[PDB]
C-alpha cells in the first residue's frame with residue numbers, strides 16, 4: 001500500500017516498485033492533473049550493514065525543458081524508532097523535474 005505525504009501544494013504518493021506520483025488535494029479528492037515523478041526502473045539491495053536504493057524514470061514531461069521527470073529514492077533508518085512503519089520523509093528537487101525522495105524505515109536501522 002502506497003505511502004503519502006503532503007508538502008505545500010503537492011501530495012506525494014510512493015508505490016514501491018511501481019511509480020511515484022505528485023498531485024493536489026482539495027478536501028480529500030485529487031483536484032486535476034496527476035503527475036508522475038517516474039515509473040519504477042531499478043533497485044539495489046545490500047544486507048548483512050544495510051543499504052537500499054531505487055530509481056524511477058520517464059515521468060511526466062517537464063514544461064521547463066520537455067524532459068521526462070526522474071526520481072531516485074534513498075532509504076534511511078527511522079531514527080524516531082517509530083511504530084507506524086515506513087514514511088516519506090523529504091522530497092528534494094535538486095534540478096528542475098529531477099527528484100530525490102527520502103524514505104525512513106525501521107528496516108534500515110543498524
Ligand SMILES: OC[C@H]1O[C@H](OC[C@H]2O[C@H](OC[C@H]3O[C@@H](O)[C@@H](O)[C@@H](O)[C@@H]3O)[C@@H](O)[C@@H](O)[C@@H]2O)[C@@H](O)[C@@H](O)[C@@H]1O
Pocket residue numbers: 009010022035062063064093096097
Ligand atoms: O514546472 C516544474 C514544476 O512543475 C510542478 O510544479 C508546478 C507548480 O506547482 C505549484 O503551483 C501549482 C498550483 O499552485 C497553487 O498555489 C495555485 O496557484 C494553483 O492554481 C496551481 O495549480 C507550486 O508548487 C509552484 O511553485 C510550481 O511551480 C511540479 O512538478 C514541480 O516539482 C516542478 O518543479
